[PDB]
Design a binder for this molecule. Structure first.
Ligand SMILES: C[C@@H](O)[C@H](N)C(=O)N[C@H]1[C@@H](O)[C@H](n2cnc3c(N)ncnc32)O[C@@H]1CO
Ligand SMILES: C[C@@H](O)[C@H](N)C(=O)N[C@H]1[C@@H](O)[C@H](n2cnc3c(N)ncnc32)O[C@@H]1CO
Ligand SMILES: [Mg+2]
Ligand SMILES: [Mg+2]
Lengths: 136, 136
């Protein structure tokens, strides 16, 4: 799993065209205030240990940043060892679940299998943009 | 070299604190309309062949997208094989130069060695977000 942590002042996305033949999630849109936006690329090796490691780290970083909202934003472009779409959607659902056991704020999982527009206003402080890798 | 191509409706950034002890570029800020925003991570293997390959591809993609502005935005987080800061700043200056020989629109190289805030409004069309790797 490869993650990008973006500490945002605001974030919004809207699904546009379907990326996959049958996207497993419905279309939609959402917007937020201050949040940790977690661009998430699911990799071939990822299993339950990977998910839990990622859940704990996202929780800790969020604690350190004093954020109370985390967006899990599926993203295909952070690495060159992608899992297949079915496995990735399963891992992202598991990650959402795991995070809720470690982090007490709002967790929003953005829809999987869609092309999307988004806007972010990312903070410029020292810890506002960090990458993470998890494996098992 | 690892790149992320984001076809933006708008983009802006502002340098905030210095990331490096002595940033090789002055501080500043800029904003744009429709542009290809190229998040650029310079990797250990990168040399002149890498730069030219990247320049040609950025030019071609930009041609395909019908954009007339390209932002070269230094970014440390797209891979786990970073070049050192001196080499990276040199390669990014070379890339800027190379791109101007292949692409006829506005090329803006954002300042290197700074923490920055940014906002983007990324389009949601099929080709609006793509990753690229170049080597030699
Ligand atoms: C493209 C851009 O607008 C959008 N944001 C997008 O990237 N959409 C991705 C993810 O929602 C998802 N997806 C497929 N495989 C994976 C994977 N291994 N890991 C994470 N997501 C995946 O399916 C789409 C690409 O097939
Ligand atoms: C952090 C975030 O707010 C900001 N956008 C940032 O990433 N700043 C980076 C780049 O400007 C640059 N830098 C250092 N090494 C590299 C490299 N190998 N490739 C590209 N840039 C580099 O130096 C800063 C990190 O040392
Ligand atoms: Mg809609
Ligand atoms: Mg300023």
């Amino acid at each position: 799993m490869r993650l990008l942590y973006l500490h945002a002042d605001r974030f919004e996305y809207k699904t546009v065209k379907p990326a996959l033949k049958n996207p497993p999630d419905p279309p939609g849109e959402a917007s937020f205030g201050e949040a940790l936006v977690v661009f998430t690329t699911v990799e071939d090796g990822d299993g339950p240990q990977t998910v839990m490691y990622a859940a704990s780290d996202i929780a800790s970083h969020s604690s350190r940043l004093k954020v109370t909202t985390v967006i899990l934003y599926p993203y295909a472009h952070l690495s060159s060892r992608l899992a297949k779409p079915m496995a990735a959607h399963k891992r992202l659902i598991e990650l959402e679940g795991a995070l809720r056991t470690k982090f007490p704020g709002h967790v929003h999982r953005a829809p999987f299998g869609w092309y999307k527009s988004f806007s972010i206003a990312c903070k410029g402080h020292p810890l506002a943009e960090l990458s993470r890798s998890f494996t098992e």
